[PDB]
UniProtKB/Swiss-Prot annotation, chain C:
Comment text on domains: The N-terminus zinc finger domain is essential for delivering the primed DNA template to the DNA polymerase. The central core domain contains the primase activity. The C-terminus region is responsible for the helicase activity and binds 1 Mg(2+)-dTTP.
Protein's name in the database: DNA helicase/primase
Protein's job: ATP-dependent DNA helicase and primase essential for viral DNA replication and recombination. The helicase moves 5' -> 3' on the lagging strand template, unwinding the DNA duplex ahead of the leading strand polymerase at the replication fork and generating ssDNA for both leading and lagging strand synthesis. ATP or dTTP hydrolysis propels each helicase domain to translocate 2 nt per step sequentially along DNA. Mediates strand transfer when a joint molecule is available and participates in recombinational DNA repair through its role in strand exchange.
Site, dTTP/dATP binding: residue positions: 10, 111
Homology family: Belongs to the Teseptimavirus DNA helicase/primase family.
Domain of life according to the entry: Viruses
Subunit structure, as described in the record: Homohexamer. Assembles as a hexamer onto linear or circular ssDNA in the presence of ATP or dTTP. Present in a mixture of heptamers and hexamers in the absence of DNA. Interacts (via C-terminus) with the viral DNA polymerase that is bound to DNA; this interaction is essential to initiate leading-strand DNA synthesis. The priming complex consists of 2 DNA polymerases and 1 helicase-primase hexamer that assemble on the DNA template. Interacts with the single-stranded DNA-binding protein.
Length: 483, 483, 141, 72
């Protein structure tokens, strides 16, 4: 059978004061911390009784730092438990001595019990005792002030009743280390009221004052205004940093112009440094397209003018004019991880505040893997991460899958988020979704519509205005239009 | 073919007493617990026969704790089954050894059988045998006294016949741990006249008096009046606790305002503690939107005013003003089970009486699973449970799929419950459905309609009033309007 | 809802009356009046198999002779399975079994799918067995 | 400041965080060869304000003038 409970008297028992710990004699006497001596050596005996009063088990110590555990030390053992059945507040300490401590201060006024296997078994011992502990208004966890001791708190509160748990925070390892010359008054200030917690993601509003203040100053409302259709602005309030704007639409080169246009005015009118990853075309190419666009002339699209400005010096002139403010920078190509990295150094190294990524549809390099359905999403996230993690504005272009339903893209057909490509990542991770529609065989083949398909920051969405293609200057001009 | 049934004699069989278990030799002999020895080592063989007497299968043991199962161990195997066809009472134990035990203590005169795959296959093995067990007046489940053993009992009785099942409750792990010096008489006191329990959810009316009284005082006919459109109230009589209100509509940010607005008035006008899980936006963001809304100013949507109130002290003032009554609390993010748990502690721990969950459409984290169609439903129920089970008022926002039929959402198009998202769980589990329609390109692009799509408590449904967006203050103001 | 109905007053639907009968003793009175004949018993919630089992013990244990099951439409718990069309039927049978097998009266409430044809439900539109929900089990069993 | 030493820089910055890395460029083999009678002030001019990069595909627009002209 199991180790007999040790009889007081049988073992030469005395209720003496622990002079080594500043626990009085009178104290040891109430909680049942008695000093026996069997077969010669003198042992310190903690008497664990159930709520009914009977001694169920003993935890015996000898000086050198050993133990011996008598009786049946059940999974729910709490030293001191039998003292209290109800109350307004019960301190729960890691070990017996620390119980003895709280049991001393104040002139001793509130219940204290200690963990039965304390340390590591905080979770078990505790949940074992839900009903017992719910007998009190608030449960004050006064555990060790270390690595495993904070952990113990955490695992404890998880299993302990409702909004009752509060964490004790002492100046030293434990409540007795404090007593033993230091700060009794520090222990005191905790037993009364000592803070509450262990919801890891619930957050009362009051407790956000500071985080809010610092937000309000830090982050910035009318971030970077879309150009060529007040409307896009009116509805989205712009492109705030750390967002992920996503331009989409049918065959739209209209799309690739719109983005280009924004790139243009951000990197010139506004001070902002634009970074471009135009994965479709060459770095030389896109540069020409900018230059021309900036001078309202279809540059690449004209043998004669090219020659003209090369010779008449206007090239080197236009070029300086637009570029010579080290404001545009392009990723030039020939993986996903590999790309993301380059994009990051744009943001982090050259410190541009917009990165335009033309055309997500191109994943590219790490081949042995299935659906672009899935992978599109994987990248999506790394992107949204990059974005929010570094506060760069990330415009992302993306092209549309093709209906199967009646009217095509050049037949104008509007687009919805369902209408969306991917398999959810973009339909999600993206903060504002601007779509552009263009019925290139119709009344206004050059008229293009802009839906705000989504906009976290405002949630004001919908038709947001119109523009018109100037086949001649190459610009998406703003247009008069409605019902 | 399958492992041959072990021939007695072929393998050096003896009906010997299990000295290790306090099972007599004469006992092993009756149930068919014999001791063979093949190819050198000595195995313990349990003989499973059908009601007809023929040996259909064997469960063989070796010393070290291994097995080997002979014959065809069908899904309905009961060890001992062939011994009893009828009776006033049959004990059913987890394993073979425990069967041998009850078979002792009783001098093998009454019936005991053991589960064929015992442990985990409690449900299957049992329901496979409905008829066999119904042959007896009462079925005494004497299973393991542990975690999975109580579970076994539960799953067992579920599939077992009518008001016959009674649970055995022993002092130790199993009926043999008892016998193996302890409390034979404890096992006895159970075989005769033990516990009969199985109603863990059936609840006679008489036994609800108290729960009813305390309900009647606590939860209110006119529980929480919707604000900004008497009408919503007139028809639905409010948001009674334990209900699940579901706000839905087109592109509606109108929707996210309406909800916000309600959060506002319940958390300030009314005493009620609101908890918010605004999954779309940050916790700081939603806090601002509140403050701004409470102050009838478009706070985040304005660089100037932000700066203004940070400096002129008005921020800290407004903030205290609105928040400083520990009445708003927010889930702040970056699974389904995981969310549900957080929302629970808001209810249970911080004890808010409304929890507003903005935007069910976001399921999130546990990815290897098909249709959001199905899953939306699964969450739906946990939620309704949460709700009714705890009396919290759970408002749940939800966004609309998009027609395919002519007029869109910003074209006002009214919504029906068919018009509904999900695949039935919301369409069902939700107690009041409030929909808001807004034809943002029309006569009153700021005018918004409110349909009550459903309301259990009253079933008075339909058009219920109008509001108008004040682009300027941010509010859904109430409006004059009808035919 | 029962108490109120028995006392021909819309009880939950009225703040004033609730308070009134709590204080004036009428609650404890009405409550005894209706309930104190151990004649009503309720399954109180938060699977199909799991439910059916509870219902059975109502029949077998407390021995009631009517079980009212309000609202079949709610199947609930064992999620990895397709059409409520199909499953509605599966339960339907266990039920009819329960019923005939034990002689309890089983009333079962059940809600209607919604037309697609002109006049709705609140427009009175009559109902046929075709008009029926499920996919045949109830329409039969 | 040698064969394998520039390589080290390259492989290093590849695995190092974002736009933080900047390469040091000294007049001699290492920072000590400099100190050992030479150019302490050369090491200094690097610790403050060294050369920042690795980008093997990022390409500022300014740095494309020529490639563009010849393209046109």
């Amino acid at each position: 059978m199991t180790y007999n409970v040790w009889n007081f008297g049988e073992s030469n028992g005395r209720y003496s004061a622990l002079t080594a710990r500043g626990i009085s004699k009178e104290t040891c006497q109430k909680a049942g911390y008695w000093i026996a001596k069997v077969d010669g050596v003198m042992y310190q005996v903690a008497d664990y009784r159930d709520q009914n009063g009977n001694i169920v088990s003993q935890k015996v110590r000898d000086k050198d730092k050993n133990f011996k555990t008598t009786g049946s030390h059940k999974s729910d053992a709490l030293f001191g438990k039998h003292l209290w059945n109800g109350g307004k507040k019960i301190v729960v300490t890691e070990g017996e001595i620390d119980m003895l401590t709280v049991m001393e201060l104040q002139d001793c006024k509130y219940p204290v019990v200690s963990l039965g296997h304390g340390a590591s078994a905080a979770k078990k011992t505790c949940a074992a005792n839900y009903e017992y502990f719910d007998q009190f208004e608030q449960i004050i966890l006064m555990f060790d002030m270390d690595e495993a001791g904070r952990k113990a708190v955490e695992e404890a509160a998880q299993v302990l009743p409702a909004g009752k748990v509060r964490v004790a925070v002492l100046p030293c390892k434990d409540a007795n280390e404090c007593h033993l010359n230091g700060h009794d008054r520090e222990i005191m200030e905790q037993v009364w009221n000592a803070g509450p917690w262990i919801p890891d993601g619930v957050v009362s509003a009051l407790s956000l004052r500071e985080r809010i203040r610092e937000h309000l100053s830090s982050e910035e409302s009318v971030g970077l205004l879309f150009s060529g259709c007040t409307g896009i602005n009116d509805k989205t309030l712009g492109a705030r940093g750390g967002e992920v704007i996503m331009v989409t639409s049918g065959s739209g080169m209209v799309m690739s112009t719109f983005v280009r246009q924004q790139a243009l005015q951000w990197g010139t009118a506004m001070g902002k440094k634009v970074g471009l990853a135009m994965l479709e075309e060459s770095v030389e190419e896109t540069a020409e397209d900018l230059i021309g666009l900036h001078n309202r002339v279809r540059l690449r699209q004209s043998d004669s003018l090219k020659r003209e400005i090369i010779e008449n010096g206007k090239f080197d002139q236009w070029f300086d004019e637009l570029f010579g403010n080290d404001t545009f920078h392009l990723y030039d190509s020939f993986e996903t991880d590999r790309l993301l990295a380059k994009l990051a150094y744009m943001r982090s190294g050259l410190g541009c505040d917009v990165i335009i990524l033309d055309h997500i549809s191109i994943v590219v390099s790490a081949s042995g893997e299935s659906d672009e359905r899935k992978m599109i999403d994987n990248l999506m996230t790394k992107l949204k991460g990059f974005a929010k993690s570094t506060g760069v504005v990330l415009v992302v272009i993306c092209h549309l899958k093709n209906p199967d339903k009646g009217k095509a893209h050049e037949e104008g057909r509007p687009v919805s988020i369902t209408d969306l490509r991917g398999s959810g990542a973009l339909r999600q991770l993206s903060d504002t979704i601007i779509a552009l529609e263009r019925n290139q065989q119709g009344d206004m083949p050059n008229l293009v519509l802009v839906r705000i398909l989504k906009c976290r920051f405002t949630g004001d969405t919908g038709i947001a205005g119109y523009m018109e293609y100037n086949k001649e200057t190459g610009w998406l001009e703003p247009s008069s239009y409605s019902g």
